[PDB]
Design a protein around this ligand. Structure first.
Ligand SMILES: Nc1ncnc2c1ncn2[C@@H]1O[C@H](COP(=O)(O)OP(=O)(O)OP(O)(O)=S)[C@@H](O)[C@H]1O
Ligand SMILES: [Mg+2]
Lengths: 279, 572
């Protein structure tokens, strides 16, 4: 019962999103957007039934592509550890409402998938044809992220220093950097938020997302026509549903009964940065 | 029978009480009061008493314990219970029965040495656990059934390892794991089984040991077994400035030349220090060596010598090693029919060394299970509803032959070997051996071979210029160095290694972190060779030299000359 008050106090802060994002794998350097996406995936959306009997997915599916050594398996292991229900596979029935991590990609379950480039390493000049998955199976994933080995001398120095600092200070002290939540506390908070309530969108946010979806579809059309080539990542109504789910999850994180325009804007920004850069 | 007399029985009970409440150690401390206070603090259910002290004080008790184990042990348990009640009356609320554990039995016997004469007698045995059951309740209690085989290192070649059953009660339940080397003190009792009688056609009793004390066979016992003369000889060898030269020259006397391969194998044998920074990720302290060579270089001879030298060693062939054989597998017991785990070769190689011959013959499916044990030194078995984790801390030495039978210097090392890049990446040291027609080298080889043939006749039964060490002395030195030294890397210049790694990236993209980790554990092992608590930069220099020699040997001929010219600073 006291943990209810603790969770209410934690979720009433104006900076719950930043604290949760920092709580997602503080050991791994960088990837703030990826950490935020992982957090909102862990929170997840809400499922809704209809009088006609049809059901709509209330879970988010994500796909990751990148060169080896970008710390993907570590992220999957952290997600499996943090989630109340988690399954890790090398490439469904036992998981109900949890998260299933699938490595080497080449039932109410959220799917987090990681895969490698077709040639082993990404080719920037060639552009497309670096993904072997068909567009039909690619459309199921809500967001697709691309990671490349950004070779910077100072970034390599910083990465080495961060790794060595973790190695050295790891045995000495195990403390939160800046207000990071403990693993058990974060797990219980996520479970409480998922069990308690689920929010819904508003009319103004709906209209804004409608206009943005129409503009994005027109832009994707124009890019496909000018490029004279079929994009491997099409945009359909499922993308709109995914953005709605992400906005609802963002509203769910604050336990508000009605979603706000800020959640929709953040969901649109994340969807842009992932899919449009990927496409 | 004589013990069953009430008078002597009660008198011995009170004598044991006086021994518990009266013994004094060499430091003037009543040890058992400290032990009972510790057990009360920990709320345990068993008490450990040294057999040596009891034998020193009461010789009659030391004579009686092997002869009448059950009655005397029950009496001692009752005496301990009443002593605890007198000292800690409230301790009846947390525990209702307390058992006395006997440790350090002077008589140690092997599973092969079990006869009828040991029946219903306390015997100390040593072995390795293979399979274990679950915790079972009894309408009296906790139960554990385990299956123990002889240690593979102790087993002579050509003879199958024998297996025995053991029973654990209460505190001893769940005190061991499969694949863990332990020694046991227990009662060698016999069991009546009509099924065996019907099958064999005559009365047969299945002998099962009921263990009293369980102690895992860590190398602490080996440290205790070391003679102070051995320690002084090891220290005198350590202060020698040419200890490394004689150590390297002492390996494979019957084989001529090939300094680099024996150097790398010795450096891997000494091993590094495994680390677990923060309990988040674990850094291995093991060196993986892959040996590709042209036929006629006596690779199998090197593997056989390593097999003999190692205290714990398992030899496997490429054709006869399956994935199920190498790893642990789930099986239904033929008698009791519960799911059981039988350890594979790698599991029995834990804390030891595993040798793979003709690794290029491995099936890819069999290769898949290898990477997990290579990277994490642990195996997670999820089969038949059983999920278990087992330690796989082993040093792996793999042998392979190039495709076509000859190594092509005009191709990359990856192309000449039919193995995937991750498998090669898991390896830390790579050594390629070729065959060249040199008349002077031919003269040296012929002379050395004929001399060795003359020396080792049953009727009749160096490059560095240093005398090789005796095999037993080398083995003792290896044990002591493995079990005593823990180096510290407090005097490393990070700028030099950073510049070297930047150059390595520059010259590798023109043609990783784990290479740095391998070099670090290599320097740790080299420091352990000299028995130094702290690492001197000479270890780092030698590790850099050997690693750079290994790396350039894996490149094409058109670029290795330029690589040598660029890195002539460190090779000189
Ligand atoms: N450098 C050497 N010095 C002394 N004896 C050697 C040497 N190289 C080979 N021999 C002898 O040659 C014998 C046969 O060599 P092998 O070990 O069969 O060859 P290999 O290099 O292992 O290639 P494979 O595995 O047989 S195809 C050994 O048992 C040694 O007695
Ligand atoms: Mg051979």
């Amino acid at each position: 019962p006291q943990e209810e008050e603790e969770f209410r106090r934690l979720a009433a802060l104006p900076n719950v999103y930043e604290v949760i994002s920092k709580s997602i794998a503080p050991s791994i350097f960088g990837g703030t957007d990826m950490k935020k996406a992982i957090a909102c995936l862990l929170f997840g959306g809400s499922r809704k039934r209809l009088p006609d009997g049809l059901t709509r997915r209330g879970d988010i599916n994500l796909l990751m592509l990148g060169d080896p050594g970008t710390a993907k398996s570590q992220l999957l292991k952290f997600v499996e550890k943090c989630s109340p229900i988690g399954v890790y596979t090398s490439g469904m029935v036992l998981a109900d409402g949890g998260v299933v991590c699938i490595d080497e990609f080449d039932s109410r379950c959220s799917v987090l998938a990681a895969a490698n480039s077709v040639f082993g390493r990404w080719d920037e000049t060639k552009g497309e044809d670096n993904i072997d998955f068909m567009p039909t199976i690619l459309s199921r994933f809500d967001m697709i992220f691309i990671v490349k080995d950004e070779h910077n001398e100072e970034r390599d120095v910083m990465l080495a220093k961060h790794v060595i600092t973790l190695h050295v200070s790891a045995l000495t002290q195990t403390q939160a950097v800046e207000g990071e939540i403990d693993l058990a506390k974060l797990k219980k908070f996520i479970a409480y938020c998922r069990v308690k309530c689920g929010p819904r969108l508003s009319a103004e946010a709906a209209e804004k997302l409608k206009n943005r979806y129409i503009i994005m579809r027109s832009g994707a059309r124009q890019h496909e026509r000018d490029s004279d080539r079929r994009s491997s990542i099409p945009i359909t109504v499922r993308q709109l549903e995914a953005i709605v789910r992400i906005a609802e999850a963002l509203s769910k994180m604050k336990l508000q009964p009605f979603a706000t325009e800020a959640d929709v804007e953040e969901a649109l920004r994340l969807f842009q940065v992932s899919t449009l850069d990927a496409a | 029978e004589w013990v069953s007399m009430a008078g002597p029985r009660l008198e011995i009970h009170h004598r044991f009480k006086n021994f518990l409440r009266t013994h004094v150690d060499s430091h003037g401390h009543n040890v058992f009061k400290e032990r009972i206070s510790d057990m009360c603090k920990e709320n345990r259910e068993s008490l450990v008493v040294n057999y040596e002290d009891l034998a020193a004080r009461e010789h009659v008790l030391a004579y009686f314990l092997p002869e009448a184990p059950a009655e005397l042990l029950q009496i001692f348990d009752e005496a301990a219970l009443e002593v605890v009640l007198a000292m800690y009356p409230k301790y009846d609320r947390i525990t209702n029965h307390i058992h006395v554990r006997i440790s350090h039995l002077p008589l140690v016997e092997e599973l092969r040495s079990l006869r009828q004469l040991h029946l219903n007698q306390l015997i100390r045995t040593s072995g390795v656990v293979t399979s274990c059951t679950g915790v079972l309740p009894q309408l009296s209690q906790n139960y554990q059934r385990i299956r123990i085989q002889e240690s593979p290192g102790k087993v002579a070649a050509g003879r199958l390892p024998r297996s025995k059953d053991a029973i654990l009660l209460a505190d001893l339940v769940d005190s061991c794991k499969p694949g863990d080397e332990i020694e046991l003190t227990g009662i060698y009792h016999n069991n009546y089984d009509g099924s065996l009688n019907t099958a064999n056609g005559f009365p047969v009793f299945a002998t099962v040991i009921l263990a009293n004390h369980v102690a895992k066979k860590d190398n602490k016992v080996a440290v205790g077994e070391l003679t102070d003369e051995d320690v002084k000889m090891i220290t005198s060898l350590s202060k020698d400035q040419q200890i490394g030269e004689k150590i390297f020259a002492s390996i494979a006397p019957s084989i001529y030349g090939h300094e680099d391969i024996k150097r790398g194998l010795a450096l891997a044998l000494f091993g590094g220090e495994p680390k677990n920074p923060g309990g988040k990720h674990k850094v291995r302290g093991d060196i993986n060596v892959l040996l590709c060579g042209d036929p006629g270089t006596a690779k199998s001879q090197f593997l056989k010598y390593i097999e003999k030298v190692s205290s714990r060693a398992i030899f496997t062939t490429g054709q006869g090693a399956s994935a199920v054989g190498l790893t642990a597998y789930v099986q239904r017991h033929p008698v009791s029919r519960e799911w059981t785990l039988e350890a594979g070769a790698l599991v029995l190689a834990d804390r030891g060394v595993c040798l793979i011959d003709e690794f290029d013959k491995m099936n890819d499916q069999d290769r898949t299970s290898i990477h997990e044990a290579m990277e994490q030194q642990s195996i997670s078995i999820s089969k038949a509803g059983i999920v278990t984790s087992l330690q796989a801390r082993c040093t792996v030495i793999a042998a392979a032959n190039p495709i076509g039978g000859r190594y092509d210097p005009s191709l990359t090392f990856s192309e000449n070997v039919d193995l995937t890049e991750p498998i090669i990446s898991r390896f830390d040291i790579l050594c390629v051996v070729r065959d060249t027609v040199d008349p002077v080298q031919d003269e040296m080889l012929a002379r050395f071979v004929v001399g060795s043939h003359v020396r080792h006749h049953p009727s009749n039964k160096n490059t560095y210029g240093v005398e090789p060490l005796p095999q037993e002395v080398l083995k003792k030195y290896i044990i002591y160095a493995k079990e005593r030294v823990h180096p510290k890397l407090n005097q490393m210049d990070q700028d030099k290694v950073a510049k070297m790694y930047s150059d390595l990236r520059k010259e590798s993209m023109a043609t990783t972190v784990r290479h740095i980790e391998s070099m670090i554990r290599m320097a740790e092992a080299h420091a352990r060779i000299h028995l130094r608590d702290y690492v001197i930069e000479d270890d780092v220099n030698m590790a850099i030299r050997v690693m750079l020699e290994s790396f350039i040997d894996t490149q094409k001929f058109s670029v290795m000359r330029s690589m040598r010219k660029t890195f002539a600073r460190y090779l000189s």
